[PDB]
């Protein structure tokens, strides 16, 4: 039943904060944790993400982690910052210098027992814990390095619980430092081994959606994070509203243990040019949802094949019309679904739409196209590593080169794995 939420580092806490703003709103929980909604449906499954405090106050089951205090302070000051349990902010002062070795081995080690203490206290009060969800980036140092350290320690203490992540991948187009390929390649290694489902959110795709479709000339991290929180709200609707526990979702979405990296999508994506108020029809939602221009990993689905596809519709709309359009698109893209997993496209509907939208759709795909994202990281990693460029920041934290080689070798193996299943047929 219950999920424990962790958010780590700058990117993780900023996206994490918006996610809680959004879904708190959807559940009628105001910024002080008081409920003021109008439907039993909002409270039916409220404990999945919220603990109940005396006086019908709802407190997010959220742990906030970081190695410098800046972003934590900004959250407490943000809209719903009062909503978070004060004891659940865990943070240091050194920072991680955008450096995976510092997040994972030197600065992070110091702080990790304190995070595990808060996790234990939240777990112990769970009637029956489903699992954990972590939001973080892979290009920085705290989200990437400490985040994957956290997942390793959680798995050791809770080996039989589900571990899912929303993981922002780096891209040169929206880049903070040149070492990002190193931090992400070291993290994918961990994720391959220790998560059950990872939602890959590529900052390049986020940017391009804001630029090309939303017609936003100069997007901000605020913009990107709004897209991500709407997508996070969509994928978790089946957990927060009547309809699906984490394990049953992973069993039906993950056909091989290592290929559990998903491509999310959202619709509608429209320009606010006196179109925003136009009622959107079920055809429009469904065509967008499967369009490349709508997917948040910079991967061409037409370049690979889908293993599984979950599509979630929100709002009041014809359930009949929904099936008609989901079937229509499978006939269109018949080529893009493997034929050896019968009935691998599945649909859910939920009547509670997001704030401000009569209907919406979220797409969750396990596509071999994702291999393109990993091979891009691999290419960037290799360009630097072959010259040992910027390696001294990591070897100076006690890491050896051999750990970089293993991580690179592990990701390339992953890429070849996607390639095998893309070419596999029922013949």
């Amino acid at each position: 039943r219950e999920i424990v939420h962790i958010q780590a580092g700058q990117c993780g806490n900023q996206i994490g904060a918006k996610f809680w703003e959004v879904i708190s709103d959807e559940h009628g929980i105001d910024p002080t944790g008081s409920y003021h909604g109008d439907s039993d449906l909002q409270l039916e499954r409220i404990n999945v993400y919220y603990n109940e405090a005396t006086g019908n106050k709802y407190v997010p089951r959220a742990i906030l982690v970081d190695l410098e205090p800046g972003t934590m302070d900004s959250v407490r000051s943000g809209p719903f910052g009062q909503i978070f349990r004060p004891d659940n902010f865990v943070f240091g002062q050194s920072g991680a210098g955008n450096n995976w070795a510092k997040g994972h081995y030197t600065e992070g080690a110091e702080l990790v027992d304190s995070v595990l203490d808060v996790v234990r206290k939240e777990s112990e009060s769970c009637d029956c814990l489903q699992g954990f969800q972590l939001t973080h980036s892979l290009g920085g140092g705290t989200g990437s390095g400490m985040g994957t350290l956290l997942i390793s320690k959680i798995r050791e203490e809770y080996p039989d619980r589900i571990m899912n992540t929303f993981s922002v991948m780096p891209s040169p187009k929206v880049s903070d430092t040149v070492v990002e390929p190193y931090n992400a390649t070291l993290s994918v290694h961990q994720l391959v081994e220790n998560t059950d489902e990872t939602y890959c959110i590529d900052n390049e795709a986020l940017y391009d959606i804001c630029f090309r479709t939303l017609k936003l000339t100069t997007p901000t991290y605020g913009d990107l994070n709004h897209l991500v929180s709407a997508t996070m709200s969509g994928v978790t609707t089946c957990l927060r509203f009547p309809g699906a526990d984490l394990r049953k979702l992973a069993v039906n979405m993950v056909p091989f243990p290592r290929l559990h990296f998903f491509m999310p999508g959202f619709a509608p994506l429209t320009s606010r040019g006196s179109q925003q108020y136009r009622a959107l029809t079920v055809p429009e939602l469904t065509q967008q949802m499967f369009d490349s221009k709508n997917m948040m990993a910079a991967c061409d689905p037409r370049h690979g094949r889908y293993l599984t596809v979950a599509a979630i519709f929100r709002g009041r709309m014809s359930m009949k019309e929904v099936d008609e359009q989901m079937l229509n698109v499978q006939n269109k893209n018949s080529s893009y679904f493997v034929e050896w997993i019968p009935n691998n496209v599945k649909t859910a509907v939920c009547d509670i739409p997001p704030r401000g939208l009569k209907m919406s759709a979220t797409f969750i795909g396990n596509s071999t196209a994702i291999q393109e994202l990993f091979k891009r990281i691999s290419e960037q990693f290799t360009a630097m590593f072959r010259r040992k460029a910027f390696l001294h920041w990591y070897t100076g934290e006690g890491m050896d080169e051999m750990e970089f080689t293993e991580a690179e070798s592990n990701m390339n193996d992953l890429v070849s794995e996607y390639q095998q299943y893309q070419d596999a047929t029922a013949d």
Binding site: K248, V251, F256, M319, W340
Partner: protein, 435 residues
């Protein structure tokens, strides 16, 4: 002679709910358990007492156990209209479910809850002066419905070796399922359960879904729609045990009348008529009998014309007299394609119960003056094993999703052993049925 019902997993529990609700309507049992026509208080051994015992305050209590590895579906029972009917011991819930993983339902969680279930079943058995056996309701595709049910049936053969066990099993349909692993769970549970079931009635959700769209004109049926229709079929199949009658009045007669070969123990059910309550033209005995040979009215879509009948049984409810049945049988046999195996007699066992079908007030099914459920053991139902077996073969050739089962302590070899058992099942049907 008592019957104990066992409802396993979400599909079994919710179908069990629709059935017991219907029973109460049919027998005149109020939601609070009281039965005004039952003039023997706290006792008696009438026909309906095969499904209900009686408290001293006059309550009529189903002879039922509800088990689910997750509590939210059984909480419905605890809070429904007929909550006042059951007591806590009859409701057994775990904390977390099998996640559509047969291995998790059978090995990991099954091992831990089976003795409690058997203990609760034992507590009903000890209330029975002459226990007949068990009716077991479950889905093929659920981790619990598939995985725990096969564990339970093994153990029931151990504990009640001389008792009959019948199955009502929901066969998986993509129209109303979100899972992709149900072909695995389906084969795994059929292989392990086969030696332990005397007679299994499969309902294909696809068929129920399509009968609800077409006959009741429901754009998108819900489980509630599907379960009300299923409970009509269950009720007419079990009415012989619950009402004064002569045909199929004890569980062993089901095997005797429908199952010459132990492994071929899956009769095809066909029901008629299904009529939208919003409508109507009232069909004849010949017409509804003719409807029983329409693939569109079957609980599993398949084509009986291209198989062989081994046995065939007609259950009528309502305004039906024998002369009507015989004239209707005579006519249809000159028109339709019907070929029995040469080593069986070409004939029908007919039962008429004069009480017309009962419906849930305010439900989608119209009250009709007569209806019929045909139970026929056709080799044509082998089509459904072939469909299921082929989906299994497609995923299994790439070992897709196998790691989830192995990770729960199952051996990869069990997939093969189960699959090869199904291959033999298909071979058995072909031998019986083809020239």
């Amino acid at each position: 002679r008592e019957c104990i019902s066992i409802h396993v997993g979400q599909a079994g529990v919710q179908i069990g709910n629709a059935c017991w609700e219907l029973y109460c309507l049919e027998h005149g049992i109020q939601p609070d358990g009281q039965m005004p026509s039952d003039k023997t208080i706290g006792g008696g051994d009438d026909s309906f007492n095969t499904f209900f015992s009686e408290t001293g305050a006059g309550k009529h209590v189903p002879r039922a156990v509800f088990v689910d590895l997750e509590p939210t579906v059984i909480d419905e029972v605890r809070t429904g209209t007929y909550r006042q009917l059951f007591h806590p011991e009859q409701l057994i819930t775990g904390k977390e479910d099998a996640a559509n993983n047969y291995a998790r339902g059978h090995y990991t969680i099954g091992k831990e809850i089976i003795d409690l279930v058997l203990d609760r079943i034992r507590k009903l058995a000890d209330q029975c002066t002459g226990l007949q056996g068990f009716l077991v309701f479950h889905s093929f595709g659920g981790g619990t419905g598939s995985g725990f049910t096969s564990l339970l049936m093994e153990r029931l053969s151990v504990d009640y070796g001389k008792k009959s066990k019948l199955e009502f099993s929901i066969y998986p349909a993509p129209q109303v399922s979100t899972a992709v692993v149900e072909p695995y769970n389906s084969i795994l549970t059929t292989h392990t359960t086969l030696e332990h079931s005397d007679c299994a009635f499969m309902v294909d959700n696809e068929a129920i879904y399509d009968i609800c769209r077409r006959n009741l004109d429901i754009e998108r049926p819900t489980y509630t729609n599907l379960n009300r229709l299923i409970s009509q079929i269950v009720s007419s199949i079990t009415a012989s045990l619950r009402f004064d009658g002569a045909l199929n009045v004890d569980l062993t007669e089901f095997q005797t009348n429908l199952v010459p070969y132990p492994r071929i123990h899956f009769p095809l059910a066909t029901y008629a008529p299904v009529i939208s309550a919003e409508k109507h033209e009232q069909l004849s005995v010949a017409e509804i009998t003719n409807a029983c040979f329409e693939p569109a009215n079957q609980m599993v879509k398949c084509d009986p014309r291209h198989g062989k009948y081994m046995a065939c049984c007609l259950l009528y409810r309502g305004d039906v007299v024998p002369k009507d049945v015989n004239a209707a049988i005579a006519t249809i046999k000159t028109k339709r394609s019907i070929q029995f195996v040469d080593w069986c007699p070409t004939g029908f066992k007919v039962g008429i119960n004069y009480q017309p079908p009962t419906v849930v007030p305010g439900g989608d099914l119209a009250k009709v003056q007569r209806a019929v459920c045909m139970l026929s053991n056709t080799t044509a139902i082998a089509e459904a094993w072939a469909r299921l077996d082929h989906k299994f073969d497609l995923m299994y050739a790439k070992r897709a999703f196998v790691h989830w089962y192995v990770g729960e302590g199952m051996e990869e070899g069990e997939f093969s052993e189960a699959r090869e058992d199904m291959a033999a099942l298909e071979k058995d049907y072909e031998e019986v049925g083809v020239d």
